Design an enzyme around this catalytic site. Structure first.
Site, PDB file in Angstrom:
ATOM      1  N   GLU A  70     -52.203 -17.168 -70.305  1.00 55.18           N
ATOM      2  CA  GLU A  70     -52.478 -16.650 -68.962  1.00 55.18           C
ATOM      3  C   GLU A  70     -51.199 -16.185 -68.247  1.00 55.18           C
ATOM      4  OE1 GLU A  70     -54.820 -19.657 -66.882  1.00 55.18           O
ATOM      5  OE2 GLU A  70     -56.163 -19.880 -68.609  1.00 55.18           O
ATOM      6  N   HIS A 109     -51.243 -25.159 -68.161  1.00 58.30           N
ATOM      7  CA  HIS A 109     -52.110 -26.096 -67.460  1.00 58.30           C
ATOM      8  C   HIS A 109     -51.856 -27.502 -67.933  1.00 58.30           C
ATOM      9  CE1 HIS A 109     -54.581 -22.798 -65.871  1.00 58.30           C
ATOM     10  NE2 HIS A 109     -54.336 -22.210 -67.036  1.00 58.30           N
ATOM     11  N   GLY A 110     -52.197 -28.451 -67.095  1.00 58.76           N
ATOM     12  CA  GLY A 110     -52.046 -29.855 -67.432  1.00 58.76           C
ATOM     13  C   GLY A 110     -53.080 -30.729 -66.766  1.00 58.76           C
ATOM     14  N   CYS A 154     -49.787 -29.061 -64.093  1.00 65.68           N
ATOM     15  CA  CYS A 154     -50.335 -29.917 -63.056  1.00 65.68           C
ATOM     16  C   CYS A 154     -50.346 -31.369 -63.525  1.00 65.68           C
ATOM     17  CB  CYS A 154     -51.857 -29.693 -62.882  1.00 65.68           C
ATOM     18  SG  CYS A 154     -52.322 -27.950 -62.864  1.00 65.68           S
TER      19      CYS A 154
END
Ligand SMILES: [Ba+2]
Ligand SMILES: [Ca+2]
Ligand SMILES: [Ca+2]
Ligand SMILES: [Ca+2]
Ligand SMILES: [Ca+2]
Ligand SMILES: [Cl-]
Lengths: 423, 192
Positions: free
Chosen positions: A143, A202-203, A235
Site C-alpha cells: 500500500e 500495518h500492525g 500501529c
C-alpha cells in the site's frame, strides 16, 4: 551526560551488573528505586522526579531507563495517548525531548536478566567474528501512494532506505515486500543474521500485518546474541499496556537455552500510527544512523530515534507530536548502536598508574573513542581520544587502590578492556 | 532536502530564509470531478485539511528569541500562474488502520469558495524549547489555489524575515555541551 535507572524495589539487586558496565564504559549511571519516588508508583510522580533530577547541578541528565512492565512503572495516559517519551519532555510546553527515555519491560527476573545481558554483550563482547552485522531487513506493505510522505508507497519508501544503507556500507539487504510475505520469511531473516530491521506497514498489538510474524513465532528465533535494532512503522506494536505481551516486548524478552534472541532495541507505537508522519521519522532515523560525524548522543538508540522524530514534528506538526509521544523505545536508550562488522582499535596504555596520579594517558588509533578508568563499576575518570590520545583526568584519589579497569569504546569498534596496576 | 532553501542572513535571533521551488511535479489522480493533480516538490509536505486543496508546504526550524514573540514577514516573493488546473482535495491524516488506496479523493465545501487557499504564503508554528535553545518552525506555502477560478499560483521564490516583536512570547525559558551538535542539525541558523 548521565543516566538514571528507575527500578522497582523487587528488581534493585538484578540491575547491579548493568549499572557497573554503563559507568565502566564512560556513562555516569545512578539508580532510583521507584517506590522511593512514590508508593504506588504513578505517572505524575515519575514526571516531577525526572524534572527535579534534570534541574540538579550541571544540567547533564540525558537518559532515563525505566525497568518493568506498565504495572511496575506506568506510562502517562491522556486521551488517545499512552506515553513514556513525555517523561523526557521537561523544558517547555512542547514535545521536544530534553532527555531520552527507554524501557526494559519485564514481568519476571528472567525478562530483566536477558535485556541486561544482551545490552552488555552488544557493547562489550561484539568482535570481528560477529559477521551478522552490516546486514539489514527491509519490510513493506503493498500500500501507499501520493498521500504518503514524499508521495512514496511503503515499498518505494523501503527501497530508498535500502539504497541509503547499501551506500553507507551495509553488505546485505533482505527485502520482504507484500504480497506473499510469510512468518517463515521473517524467522529466516533473523536466524540468518541481521543488525537492523525497518518495517513500514500495518500492525496489531502482537504482530506485523506484512508477513503475519508475531509474538507466537518469536520462540522459533535462534539468533543467539545476533540481535538487530528495529525502526518500526506500524500501529500498536509497542502497546505494552495490552493484556498479553506486545510485539516489541516478546522480541526484547526472547530467550533460547538461556541465550538472548529477538532484538537488542526497538522503537514501536503504543497506538495506531498515521500514514505519512512516521515515514518521515523512519527516514530521518536511518539518515542519522548513516551520518559520518555525529555526537556520542546521536550514536545511541535513544539519540538516533528521538532526533529522527524531531523532523517529524518540524514537518507534520500536531500529528507528528502525537506520533513522537507514542513511539516508545524498548531497550536501553543509551545503547551504542552498531551498524557494521567492527574493526579492532590499537590501544596503548601504561601497565601501571601512580597512587598520587591526577591524569592517565591512553594512546588510541581511533579518534572519537571514549577511554574510561573505573573501579569495580565506579567511574574514576573519562576522556575522548583526540589527536591519537586520551588524557583521562581522575575525579577522585586512587592512593589506597590496588588495580583500576581501563575501558575503551569506539563506534563500530571492538571494545578494549585492560587492567591497570596501582603502584 | 530542498537544496535551493538557504539561510541568507542571521543576526542574534533575527533570520532571513530563502525558499526556491525545486522539482515541482503533478500526479494525476481519479476524482468525482475528473482527473485532478496532486502537487509534489523537494521537501514538500501535505498537511492540508481533509477536503481542502493538496497544497504542500516546506518547513524549517530556527533558533529564535528567548523571551519575545516572533513574527514572519515576506520581504521578497515571485510567482507564476497556472490556469484551468484541478488540484486534488486532501484525504487528511490517514491512519495505518486504513488502506489509503481504498480512500477516495472527496471535495469539501472549501471548493465553492472564491479565494486563494491556504491564504498565507508564510507562517510560524508554535514556539518550542529544545533543552537550552528556544526554537520556532517557519513554513513556506508556495502553492496557492483558488478552487472556483481553477487558478494555481506557483511561488518560484519566497524570502522571509523572522524577527522578534515588542510582545512577550509563548513557551519562554528561565556546563553541558552534548546537545551542541543536535542544535546545529535541528536549527539552520544555529552555527551562524
Ligand atoms: Ba521515505
Ligand atoms: Ca522541550
Ligand atoms: Ca506488557
Ligand atoms: Ca575500590
Ligand atoms: Ca574489578
Ligand atoms: Cl510566541
Amino acid at each position: 551526560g548521565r543516566m538514571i535507572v528507575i527500578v522497582p524495589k523487587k528488581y534493585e539487586e538484578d540491575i547491579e551488573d548493568f549499572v557497573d558496565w554503563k559507568n565502566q564504559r564512560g556513562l555516569r549511571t545512578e539508580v532510583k528505586v521507584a517506590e522511593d519516588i512514590a508508593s504506588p508508583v504513578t505517572a505524575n510522580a515519575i514526571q516531577q522526579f525526572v524534572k527535579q533530577e534534570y534541574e540538579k547541578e550541571g544540567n547533564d541528565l540525558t537518559y532515563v531507563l525505566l525497568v518493568g512492565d506498565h504495572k511496575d512503572i506506568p506510562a502517562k495516559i491522556t486521551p488517545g495517548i499512552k506515553s513514556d517519551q513525555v517523561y523526557g519532555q521537561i523544558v517547555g510546553n512542547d514535545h521536544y525531548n530534553e532527555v531520552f527515555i527507554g524501557r526494559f519491560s519485564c514481568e519476571s527476573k528472567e525478562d530483566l536478566k536477558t535485556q541486561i545481558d544482551r545490552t552488555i554483550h552488544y557493547e562489550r563482547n561484539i568482535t570481528t567474528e560477529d559477521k551478522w552485522l552490516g546486514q539489514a531487513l527491509c519490510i513493506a506493505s503493498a500500500e501507499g501512494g501520493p498521500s504518503a510522505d514524499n508521495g512514496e508507497s511503503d515499498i518505494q519508501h523501503e527501497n530508498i532506505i535500502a539504497n541509503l544503507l547499501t551506500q553507507y556500507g551495509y553488505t546485505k539487504i533482505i527485502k520482504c515486500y507484500d504480497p506473499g510475505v510469510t512468518p517463515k520469511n521473517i524467522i529466516d531473516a533473523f536466524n540468518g543474521g541481521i543488525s537492523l530491521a525497518n518495517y513500514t506497514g500495518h500492525g496489531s498489538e502482537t504482530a506485523w500485518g506484512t508477513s503475519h510474524f508475531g509474538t507466537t513465532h518469536v520462540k522459533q528465533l535462534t539468533n543467539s546474541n545476533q540481535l538487530p535494532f528495529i525502526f518500526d512503522v506500524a500501529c500498536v506494536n509497542g502497546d505494552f499496556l495490552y493484556n498479553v505481551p506486545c510485539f516489541a516486548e516478546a522480541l526484547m524478552r526472547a530467550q533460547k537455552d538461556g541465550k538472548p534472541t529477538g532484538t537488542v532495541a526497538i522503537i514501536a507505537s503504543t497506538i495506531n500510527q498515521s500514514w505519512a508522519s512516521p515515514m518521515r521519522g523512519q527516514d530521518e532515523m536511518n539518515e542519522i544512523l548513516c551520518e559520518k560525524h555525529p555526537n556520542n548522543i546521536k550514536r545511541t538508540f535513544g539519540g538516533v530515534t528521538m532526533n529522527g522524530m524531531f523532523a517529524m514534528v518540524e514537518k507534520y506538526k500536531k500529528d507528528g507530536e502525537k506520533m513522537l509521544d507514542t513511539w516508545t523505545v524498548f531497550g536501553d536508550p543509551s545503547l551504542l548502536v552498531r551498524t557494521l562488522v567492527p574493526t579492532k582499535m590499537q590501544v596503548t596504555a601504561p601497565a601501571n598508574i601512580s597512587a598520587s596520579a591526577q591524569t592517565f594517558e591512553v594512546a588510541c588509533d581511533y579518534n572519537g573513542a571514549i577511554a574510561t578508568l573505573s573501579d569495580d563499576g565506579d567511574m574514576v575518570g573519562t576522556a575522548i581520544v583526540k589527536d591519537g590520545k586520551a588524557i583521562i583526568k581522575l575525579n577522585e584519589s586512587i592512593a589506597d587502590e590496588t588495580n583500576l579497569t581501563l575501558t575503551v569504546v569506539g563506534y563500530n569498534k571492538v571494545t578494549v578492556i585492560k587492567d591497570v596496576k596501582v603502584e | 532536502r530542498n537544496p535551493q532553501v538557504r539561510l541568507l542572513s542571521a543576526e542574534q535571533s533575527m533570520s532571513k530564509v530563502q525558499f526556491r521551488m525545486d522539482n515541482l511535479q503533478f500526479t494525476g489522480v481519479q476524482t468525482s470531478k475528473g482527473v485532478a493533480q496532486v502537487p509534489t516538490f523537494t521537501e514538500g509536505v501535505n498537511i492540508s485539511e481533509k477536503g481542502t486543496p493538496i497544497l504542500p508546504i516546506l518547513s524549517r526550524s530556527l533558533a529564535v528569541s528567548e523571551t519575545r514573540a516572533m513574527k514572519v514577514e515576506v520581504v521578497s516573493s515571485k510567482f507564476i500562474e497556472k490556469k484551468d488546473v484541478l488540484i486534488a482535495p486532501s484525504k487528511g491524516v490517514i491512519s495505518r488502520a486504513e488502506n489509503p488506496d481504498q480512500i477516495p479523493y472527496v471535495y469539501g465545501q472549501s471548493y465553492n469558495e472564491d479565494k486563494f487557499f491556504p491564504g498565507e504564503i508564510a507562517t510560524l508554528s508554535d514556539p518550542f524549547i529544545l533543552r537550552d535553545v528556544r526554537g520556532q518552525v517557519v513554513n513556506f506555502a508556495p502553492l496557492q489555489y483558488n478552487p472556483v477560478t481553477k487558478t494555481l499560483r506557483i511561488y518560484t521564490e519566497i524570502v522571509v524575515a523572522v524577527s522578534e516583536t515588542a510582545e512577550a512570547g509563548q513557551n519562554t525559558i528561565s556546563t553541558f555541551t552534548g546537545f551542541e551538535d543536535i542544535y546545529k542539525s535541528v536549527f539552520m541558523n544555529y552555527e551562524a
